[PDB]
Design a protein around this ligand. Structure first.
Ligand code: CLA
Ligand code: CLA
Ligand code: CLA
Ligand code: CLA
Ligand code: CLA
Ligand code: CLA
Ligand code: CLA
Ligand code: CLA
Ligand code: CLA
Ligand SMILES: CC1=C(C/C=C(\C)CCC[C@H](C)CCC[C@H](C)CCCC(C)C)C(=O)c2ccccc2C1=O
Ligand code: SF4
Ligand code: SF4
Lengths: 732, 165, 73, 61, 80, 75
């Protein structure tokens, strides 16, 4: 019995190919491993984190180098408009002269892809100018990569396999991460900012060789050391400062004015300095809360247990939590995932709204790509967070400790929870769809005067409260009579109101019934996806149908056709069904963003506000209208720079349509097939000579379901990305 | 006007869209006779269109640059500016009729539940019972609030329940 | 299979038999015998092409066809 | 146990009829562990309307 | 072999034994039920999991369940 | 079988009666080459009357494709 799946000796004895399959499948499920002990597990996750760090460092340094080698940077910095960035040298023995020529036109002497990854804007904005420096940065990042790998090995070793005490300590790490890894981080961030970048924005090159010879401000630290902190905020950059030059320069270093730099349309480096500085101080002072070995500090368990309301309204309040979290790792995993998911969301939301990169909000390709990519990342992250919370329930949960407190009370009212979620999702669906189709029928009868168009009154309210006075509520930020108006009049409100009054920046666009309706569709998608996920998470312990489901673990295919059939009852399968709704929602939000921004950049935003309230308008005017170029990327005539994108379009369509077969057909059929087939293979003459090792069978139910989902999602994301990029670039 | 709108009775897009609808209507109608049933149909059509535009303008409807009307949903706003005839009255009417339907349904279910063949009464309906319960479904809001004040509509903790809780 | 076969029939007819006499004026002028041996050509030149009247059939007695197109999707 | 035809309230957590009430068919006077026999009027997920139980598991209500 | 487990509610109605297509079961003398018989599964290595038995057993909370395990030539019932 | 047959006869009689009472068939007989068959007509209600397409023959409605016109002329 071959050593296939090592960690799993039973499979290692399996003479079928499912050996190979599942041995691959459960590689990293260290809980489900042989002789798994706790300190073992911990040192394993420790090496894993090392691996992840090394990978990410290699990724970044690799992009750094590929640019530093084959990019158009040092020309690009000159004209930040008519210079498109070079991705990486194209090489292929298949490409004919037409493609070479067509691919050659776009960068320099040789076919090249045009990177749409914003790294150009970023790096130049931070102060990157010359290829020499990019080489330096890349090689240094690779240095750190190898260092992390070596740390992985060294800490694997016996004399450094760490103690479970230093592992499970919490206050120490929390203090160290809220003081050092965060505060000092932003502090050194500001350090580079002020001592390097803003000089370069003054056209002032300051390298490592001479940076020990330049005061970043007229008077070194004297006003601070007197307590005169206002002095460093004097003489800011003019509204005429040609970016990266000494023209229109100023001498303040820590400003607060609001509004974008008028030429860059990118916010003030001085403001960025003061921001990261302020939050650095806040973090460092925050990291002094809890009790390490100094008597002073906090007692986490004390705080928790004290945090329990009278009147038994929560009963045990926060009883038994401290350990159920300080022990169960699935819980922390779920927490961290949900957190970073929300953070990726907010990242995209603020990136498009207030582009902080120099000459960002001009490369619409860059903007759209960045935004939608971070969106999809966040969606995936949250879905996984929920899956892992469910697994925490199925395995690490205990009733005795968590008994009586909020955790128990959850499972107590799970029924009402799920029921109300179902109801809200159902009503949203009903009314939103009905309204849309009424709009469509009024359109198709050519009676647009009849269709309904709700006004986003609340949103206009909030924006007028924000100071965009257009609609004329004029209270508390666009009411000049406002006390806050008068108070903060002199500091950032000027640039703030200016930029919010511009209608060409991405700042607080106007709004209407289209925005209203798509908002409600978004809310519905959110609610129903969360519903599916949480039902799957909570019913993982015990169901009325299968009261002992907890005895089977997280994943299992089915439970026999009896009892009236049990298809896909695992919480695993609940997640497997939630993923579809997640994709649906993210697709909707990205479509809407893309259409409105296209209409903005072109000019007929009226066309958006009209064709955006009925689905036929959406479809015909947005997809079928924007498809015309891609499907012409080549033709029986020739080709162009978009032939590849048309090809990828079609390729994704095929991936999708093939993964469908996975999703729909099930096993026993293919099993009968493969049986007849193997009879043929051995009974035909001269073929029975060779004989395989691992026996052939169809895929297990869950295996097939997963491979199908993979095919589906891959095809999906490919087609959409190709379409989007083709449209934006071939049109702008 | 409100939030940056103007009464449909005044919007120019309103009028120009109307002229365009009528340029279409005339330059389509001029192909038929005057006495043809097609002709009289087209005439009634244009007439109804004019009547519709008249009613919408007289209602004081708001319509921005689109010319297409719009609706506002805040009780205070709609009332302070005479816009209750668009959302408020409709939502209250629907709530009433829906509560009616639900209540008569609940009463039928309960009444037929205490009989010798619930499955049979559920697959086949008692006409007299249906009619009685229908006509008595009227005062359903009062009946329901009274049941609440007696604390009868909600059941105690005796429901079928999964093993954990 | 049946879907594909009726597609074949429709495109062949429209492209190389149909039209009006002046010679003849084929409705697509015969793009078939060169746009029907590539899939991209298929998609664009036949489908994405002929979808025009069905996706602009509004305000006319053909609005029903577009509505049903949507409902069927 | 209670005389035949009496009405009790099932309480076994696993039981499909949990927290419900059913009619006792009969009780074995002998010492079998689940002498209680309870009809019902709402079949479970397999089509059964009568289940057996021990003494404690039920309450005559 | 896939795992099997009887329970004290084995009424001995043999419908388990009456169902299994793999002779993974048999009925023994017992006492806890009036039929004085409790099902018995002495030959797990030939159960393939077809769950006809779990489909049978009329105890309200089942009585005797099956659980899936690893595989072999003997186990999976594959003719080749 | 007898039920199936009766249903078919019903639907056939329906086709023929519609062609008799709500068609431009005689106009199409006068000129086939420019009058288009139309037998299904809509009711002047909430707005579905826009479908009454001018098929010629001073007639309005919806174009049929069944070919009963050419069939009947052939007969
Ligand atoms: C980690 C990311 C990464 C990726 C995805 C690639 C991918 C590729 N590199 Mg490599 N490359 C990277 C980092 C990376 N490189 C790094 C960190 C260096 C620094 C030494 C290089 C240096 C390098 C050279 C010198 C060359 C490539 C080339 C290539 C291509 C052929 C092999 C391939 C597309 C070749 C190329 O450009 O082919 C077109 C090529 O000649 N790479
Ligand atoms: C955390 C990183 C960091 C580091 C290592 C340094 C290091 C230095 N700073 Mg300081 N400095 C920093 C952040 C940092 N600074 C920040 C964030 C600010 C703004 C609040 C300043 C503002 C500042 C000024 C205004 C001056 C220095 C100066 C100096 C030098 C003498 C002190 C020294 C090289 C002096 C100098 O000569 O710098 C070159 C000097 O005049 N720094
Ligand atoms: C609303 C939040 C809150 C509340 C109610 C308290 C309450 C308390 N803190 Mg404080 N504390 C807080 C936030 C809060 N803290 C934050 C955000 C930090 C981070 C800087 C700290 C860091 C901190 C430390 C370092 C210590 C306390 C301590 C204390 C306790 C004694 C204070 C003392 O000795 O005064 C006179 C007191 C119950 C002391 C203690 O022993 O707490 C258990 C203690 O050593 N706190
Ligand atoms: C005036 C009445 C009142 C009300 C409405 C609330 C409201 C609340 N209390 Mg309670 N609470 C009150 C007085 C009140 N508390 C008083 C006087 C005490 C002192 C015994 C507490 C001590 C207390 C604790 C210790 C906790 C609450 C908690 C809570 C919250 C969840 C229940 C909620 C905000 C819980 C909470 O979420 O606190 C943040 C909680 O753990 N309360
Ligand atoms: C593995 C996935 C992944 C990848 C490949 C990228 C890729 C990128 N990120 Mg990152 N990013 C990711 C996940 C990812 N990000 C997540 C999960 C977060 C949330 C913590 C962020 C938050 C983030 C920020 C805040 C920024 C980037 C930026 C960037 C760009 C510069 C490098 C690049 C397009 C930079 C950017 O947008 O440059 C244009 C940038 O400023 N990312
Ligand atoms: C920090 C990220 C992280 C980590 C460390 C893990 C770790 C793990 N995941 Mg994964 N997982 C994550 C995020 C993460 N996951 C996300 C974002 C997704 C979305 C695709 C999922 C969804 C997911 C599922 C649905 C399952 C796992 C499972 C697992 C386990 C086996 C992985 C092979 C392992 C404990 C498996 C597991 O634990 O089974 C018991 C499992 O069933 N994960
Ligand atoms: C809960 C959500 C909500 C929201 C976002 C709004 C929004 C609005 N309401 Mg309020 N309103 C609501 C529900 C809501 N209302 C409901 C259900 C009622 C029925 C009782 C009212 C009754 C009402 C009246 C009678 C008036 C408003 C007014 C307003 C406007 C200014 C006040 C404001 O900023 O309110 C923000 C949101 C809230 C205050 C939430 C609480 C809502 C309660 C139910 C009523 C509060 C009324 C408020 C104090 C009036 C200030 C004047 C604004 C369009 C005023 C207006 O038309 O100004 C032009 C006004 O006169 N509303
Ligand atoms: C007499 C008629 C009647 C009444 C009063 C109720 C009562 C209820 N139904 Mg409805 N419901 C009924 C028949 C009825 N239902 C029937 C025949 C169906 C079709 C199978 C459903 C299917 C159904 C579902 C699936 C849901 C409701 C929900 C509800 C709740 C709120 C009302 C609603 O939105 O619907 C409540 C439990 C929703 C709920 O639980 O809201 C909290 C919900 O999710 N009902
Ligand atoms: C073959 C099946 C069939 C179908 C689908 C329809 C369909 C229709 N018939 Mg009916 N109709 C049919 C057979 C059918 N009819 C038959 C057998 C008769 C003879 C009794 C009629 C006689 C008839 C009349 C006289 C009228 C309709 C009308 C209608 C329309 C509304 C009812 C609708 C298009 C009405 C209509 O189209 O009005 C314009 C109408 O007035 N039908
Ligand atoms: C077609 C089909 C099969 C038959 C297909 C099988 C057994 C797999 C065939 C694999 C082919 C021969 C090669 C696989 C090619 C992949 C690209 C391999 C990827 C390998 C990774 C390591 C990259 C099933 O087994 C099945 C099971 C359950 C539901 C539906 C179906 C189903 O539809
Ligand atoms: S799973 Fe059930 S039916 Fe199949 S062999 Fe085992 S006991 Fe018999
Ligand atoms: S487990 Fe069920 S089928 Fe098997 S002997 Fe007992 S009562 Fe009969």
């Amino acid at each position: 019995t071959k050593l296939f799946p090592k960690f799993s000796q039973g499979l290692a004895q399996d003479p079928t190919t499912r050996r190979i399959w599942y041995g691959l499948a459960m590689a990293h499920d260290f809980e489900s491993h042989d002789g798994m002990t706790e300190e073992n597990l911990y040192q394993k996750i420790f090496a894993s984190h090392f691996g992840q760090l090394s990978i990410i460092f290699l990724w970044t340094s690799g992009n750094l180098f590929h640019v530093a080698w084959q990019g158009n940077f040092e020309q690009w910095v000159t004209d930040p408009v008519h210079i498109r960035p070079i991705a990486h040298a194209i090489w292929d023995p298949h490409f004919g002269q037409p493609a070479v020529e067509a691919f050659t036109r776009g960068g320099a002497s040789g076919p090249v892809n045009i990177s749409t990854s914003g790294v150009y804007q970023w790096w130049y904005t931070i102060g990157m100018r010359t290829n020499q420096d990019l080489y330096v940065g890349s090689v240094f990042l690779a240095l750190v990569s190898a260092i992390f790998l070596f740390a992985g090995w060294l800490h694997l070793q016996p004399n450094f396999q760490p103690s479970l005490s230093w592992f499970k300590d919490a206050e120490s790490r929390l203090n160290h991460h809220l003081s050092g890894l965060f505060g000092v981080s932003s502090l050194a961030w500001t350090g580079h900012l002020v001592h390097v970048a803003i000089p370069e924005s003054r056209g002032q090159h300051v390298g490592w060789d001479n940076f020990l010879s330049v005061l970043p401000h007229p008077q070194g630290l004297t006003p601070f050391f007197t307590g005169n902190w206002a002095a460093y905020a004097q003489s800011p950059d003019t509204a005429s400062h040609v970016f990266g030059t000494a023209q229109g320069s100023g001498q303040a270093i820590l400003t607060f004015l609001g509004g974008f730099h008028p030429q860059t349309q990118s916010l003030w480096l001085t403001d960025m300095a003061h921001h990261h500085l302020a939050i650095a101080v806040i973090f460092i002072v925050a990291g002094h809360m809890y009790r390490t070995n100094f008597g002073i500090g906090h007692r986490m368990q004390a705080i928790l247990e004290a945090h329990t309301p009278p009147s038994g309204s929560l009963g045990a309040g926060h009883k038994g939590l401290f350990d159920t979290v300080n022990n169960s790792l699935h819980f922390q995993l779920g927490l961290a995932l949900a957190s970073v998911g929300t953070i990726t969301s907010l990242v995209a939301q603020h990136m498009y709204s207030l582009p902080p990169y120099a000459f960002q909000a001009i490369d619409f390709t860059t903007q759209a790509a960045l935004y939608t990519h971070h969106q999809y990342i966040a969606g995936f992250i949250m879905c996984g967070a929920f899956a892992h919370g469910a697994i925490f329930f199925i395995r690490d949960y205990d009733p005795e400790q968590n008994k009586g407190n909020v955790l128990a009370r959850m499972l107590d009212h799970k029924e009402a929870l799920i029921s109300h979620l179902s109801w809200v999702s159902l009503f949203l669906g009903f009314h939103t769809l009905g309204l849309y189709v009424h709009n469509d029928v009024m359109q198709a009868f050519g009676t647009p005067e009849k269709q309904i168009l709700i006004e986003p009154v609340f949103a206009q309210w909030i924006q007028a409260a924000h100071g965009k006075a257009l609609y004329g509520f004029d209270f508390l930020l666009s009411s000049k009579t406002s006390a806050a108006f008068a108070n903060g009049q002199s500091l950032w409100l000027p640039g703030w109101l200016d930029a919010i009054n511009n209608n060409q920046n991405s700042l607080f666009l106007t709004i209407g019934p289209g925005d209203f309706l798509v908002h409600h569709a978004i809310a519905l998608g959110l609610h129903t996806t969360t519903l599916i996920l949480v039902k799957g998470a909570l019913d993982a312990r015990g169901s009325k149908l299968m009261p002992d489901k907890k005895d089977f673990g997280y994943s299992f295919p089915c439970d026999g056709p009896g009892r009236g059939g049990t298809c896909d009852i695992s919480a695993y399968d609940a997640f497997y069904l939630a993923v579809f709704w997640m994709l649906n929602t993210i697709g909707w939000v990205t479509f809407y963003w893309h259409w409105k921004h296209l209409t903005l950049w072109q000019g007929n935003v009226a066309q958006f506000d009209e064709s955006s309230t009925y689905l036929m308008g959406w479809l015909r005017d947005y997809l079928w209208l924007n498809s015309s170029q891609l499907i012409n990327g080549y033709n029986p005539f020739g080709m162009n720079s978009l032939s590849v994108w048309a090809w990828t379009f079609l390729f994704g369509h095929l991936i999708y349509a093939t993964g469908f077969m996975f999703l729909i057909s099930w096993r026993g059929y293919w099993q009968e097939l493969i049986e007849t087939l193997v009879w043929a293979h051995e009974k035909t003459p001269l073929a029975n000579l060779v004989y395989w090792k691992d026996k052939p069978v169809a895929l297990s139910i869950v295996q097939a379901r997963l491979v199908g989902l993979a095919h589906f999602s891959v095809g999906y994301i490919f087609t959409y990305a190709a379409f989007l990029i083709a449209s934006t670039s071939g049109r702008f | 006007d409100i939030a940056g709108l103007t009464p449909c009775s005044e919007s120019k897009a309103y009028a120009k869209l109307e002229k365009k609808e009528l340029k279409t209507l005339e330059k389509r109608l001029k192909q038929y006779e005057a006495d043809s049933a097609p002709a009289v149909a087209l005439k009634a059509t244009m007439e109804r269109t004019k009547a519709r535009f008249a009613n919408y303008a007289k209602a004081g409807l708001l319509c921005g640059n689109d010319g297409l009307p719009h609706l506002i949903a805040d009780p205070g706003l709609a009332l302070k500016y005479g816009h209750a005839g668009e959302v408020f009255i409709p939502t209250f009417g629907f709530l009433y009729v829906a509560g009616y339907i639900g209540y008569v349904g609940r009463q039928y279910l309960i009444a037929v539940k205490g009989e010798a063949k619930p499955t049979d009464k559920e697959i086949i309906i008692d006409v007299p019972l249906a009619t009685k319960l229908a006509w008595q479904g009227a005062g359903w809001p009062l009946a329901a609030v009274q049941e609440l004040q007696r604390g009868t509509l909600l059941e105690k903790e005796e429901n079928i329940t999964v093993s954990p809780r | 299979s049946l879907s594909i076969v009726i597609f074949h029939f429709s495109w062949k007819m429209q492209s190389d038999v149909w039209g009006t006499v002046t010679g003849v004026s084929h409705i697509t002028g015969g793009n078939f015998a060169q746009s029907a041996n590539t899939i991209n050509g298929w998609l664009r030149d036949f489908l994405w092409a002929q979808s025009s009247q069905v996706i602009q059939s509004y305000g006319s007695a053909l609005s029903a066809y577009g509505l049903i197109f949507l409902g069927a999707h | 146990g209670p005389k035949r035809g009496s009405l009790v309230k099932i309480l076994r957590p696993e039981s499909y009829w949990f927290n419900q009430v059913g009619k006792v068919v009969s009780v074995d006077q002998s010492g079998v562990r689940y002498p209680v026999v309870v009809r019902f009027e709402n079949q479970n997920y397999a089509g059964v309307t009568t289940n057996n139980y021990a003494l404690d598991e039920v309450v005559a209500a | 072999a896939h795992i099997v487990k009887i329970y004290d509610t084995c009424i001995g109605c043999t419908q388990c034994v009456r169902a299994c297509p793999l002779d993974v079961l048999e009925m023994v003398p017992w006492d806890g039920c009036k039929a004085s018989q409790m099902a018995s599964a002495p030959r797990t290595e030939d159960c393939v999991g077809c769950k006809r038995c779990e489909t049978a057993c009329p105890t309200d909370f089942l009585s005797v369940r099956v659980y899936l395990g690893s595989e072999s030539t003997r186990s999976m019932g594959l003719s080749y | 079988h007898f039920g199936q047959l009766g249903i078919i006869f019903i639907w056939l009689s329906g086709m023929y009666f519609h062609g008799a009472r709500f068609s431009n068939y005689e106009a199409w007989l006068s000129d086939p080459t420019h009058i288009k068959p139309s037998a299904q007509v809509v009711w002047p209600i909430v707005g579905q009357e826009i479908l009454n397409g001018d098929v010629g023959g001073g007639f309005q409605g919806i174009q049929i494709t069944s070919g009963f016109f050419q069939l009947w002329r052939a007969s």
